[PDB]
Amino acid sequence: MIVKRPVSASLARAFFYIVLLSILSTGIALLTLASSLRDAEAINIAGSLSMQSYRLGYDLQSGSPQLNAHRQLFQQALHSPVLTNLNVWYVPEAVKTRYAHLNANWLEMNNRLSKGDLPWYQANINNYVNQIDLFVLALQHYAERKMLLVVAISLAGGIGIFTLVFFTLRRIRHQVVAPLNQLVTASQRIEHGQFDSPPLDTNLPNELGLLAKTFNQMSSELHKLYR
Amino acid sequence: MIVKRPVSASLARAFFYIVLLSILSTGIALLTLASSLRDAEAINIAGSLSMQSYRLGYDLQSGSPQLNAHRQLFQQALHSPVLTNLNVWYVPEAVKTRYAHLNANWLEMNNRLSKGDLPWYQANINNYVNQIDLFVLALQHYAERKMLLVVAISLAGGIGIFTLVFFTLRRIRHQVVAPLNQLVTASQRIEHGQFDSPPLDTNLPNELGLLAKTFNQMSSELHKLYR
């Protein structure tokens, strides 16, 4: 007789998938989360462009001496590390295309401000800032989709591990634990002149199926000897 | 003889902790994530207050007919659902205390704007908006701490499940799989007149420790009979 389906191989497999599913879930989540750590910063800084843009016009109307320093504070913000890092493959094209528009708009805005053209500012500042808000809204939606992705993965991971464990434990109980108990009981009985108990089920394709067959034959011979 | 440590109870326990750790991790993460879904929105809207505040001053300087509609657009934003939901127990006191300051500042700002007091606006708008930025920065840091919490949990969860599985599989192999193989080999040997092989180790406190003892006695008697 032979064991066609060893428990060692079955168990190895069962646990492998439990881990795999854990590593996968955890991995995607951590990779997503890692890409998101500075989302709130990006949205903050991006949003500040809106305010800086209207401040500039307020500076211009009031002849503020801070105009030039504010024009340089915008440029630094616009080209901040957090925003320049947006030009990366996993960031949606829309977010990158809008950022490029903002950079082009600034060149005209900053030029007009150097000439002190107030009438042009008053005629364009609404549209100018609208494009900035649509960029902030883009970052917001992007940050939301990524967080939702983590929720889906976290949920499927947990549900997936709960499901695997259920069936894995259900298989071990049916194919190992229960039969083992039947072997122990039969063994304890045979050891005490109890020989007329239901023979052991031998239909399992694993080690316990073989043990049952050997026991059914080590037992049946005794009963006959005595008996 | 008896089984002092059944495999059924040992396994139940092992898998229980694997699930528990999965449910716990997943649960805290999903609860944190659920509280964070609108973080990016809050930061966006909060940041827009900064811009709306300077626009109002720009309106005032240019005698814009939109002044009153913008004064009403700020109030709606300031009291938006996303910001009013901040007054909840799990939100840090700082974020709630700053929001309360913004609401008080608005009452004075909106009043001065109704009187058309430009000189007061010019003298206060810097400080006014600074408090708004510190509120946005507070929301940003809050959103960052919560995301980091999810990273810690996700990491510990994955590492925790990988660790549990390792030792759980290592215990089953040492206490079930290996001995089972020894029982099968001995059984296959005894079945073919091989009687001088090393007796089975009987030191396990589980079912297999008992089976070994019964086998060592069902075997030893045969060898003597024949042999």
Author numbering:
A (entry chain A), B (entry chain A): 1 to 227
Copied sentences from the primary study:
Among the best studied TCSs are the nitrate/nitrite-sensing systems NarX-NarL and NarQ-NarP, responsible for the regulation of anaerobic respiration. NarX phosphorylates NarL in the presence of nitrate and dephosphorylates NarL in its absence; NarQ phosphorylates both NarL and NarP in the presence of nitrate or nitrite and dephosphorylates both proteins in the absence of ligands. Both NarQ and NarX consist of seven domains: a four-helical periplasmic sensor domain, TM bundle, HAMP domain, so-called signaling helix, GAF-like domain, dimerization and histidine phosphotransfer domain, and, finally, catalytic kinase domain. Whereas the sequence identity between NarQ and NarX is ~28%, their ligand binding sites—membrane-proximal parts of the sensor domain’s helices H1 called P boxes—are very well conserved: 14 out of 15 amino acids (residues 42–56 in NarQ) are identical, and the differing ones, Ile45 in NarQ and Lys49 in NarX, are responsible for the differentiation between nitrate and nitrite.
Previous studies of NarX showed that replacing the arginine residue (Arg54, corresponding to Arg50 in NarQ) that coordinates the bound nitrate with lysine or serine resulted in loss of ligand sensitivity and locking of the receptor in the phosphatase state. We obtained the crystals of the R50S mutant of the sensor-TM-HAMP fragment of NarQ using the in meso approach, similarly to our previous work on the wild type protein and its R50K mutant. The crystals diffracted to ~2.0 Å, however the diffraction was anisotropic, and the final dataset was processed to the resolution of 3.3, 2.4, and 2.2 Å along the reciprocal lattice vectors. We solved the phase problem using molecular replacement with the structure of the ligand-bound WT sensor-TM-HAMP fragment as a search model. Surprisingly, the backbone of the R50S mutant has the same structure as the ligand-bound WT fragment, despite the Arg→Ser mutation and absence of nitrate in the ligand-binding site. In particular, there is a break in the α-helical structure between TM1 and the helix H1 of the sensor domain, whereas TM2 and the sensor domain helix H4 form a continuous α-helix. A hydrogen bond between Ser50 and Asp133 is observed in the crystal structure of the R50S mutant but not in the MD simulations. We conclude that the crystal structure of the R50S is partially artefactual, and the protein is trapped in the ligand-bound-like conformation by crystallization conditions or crystal contacts.
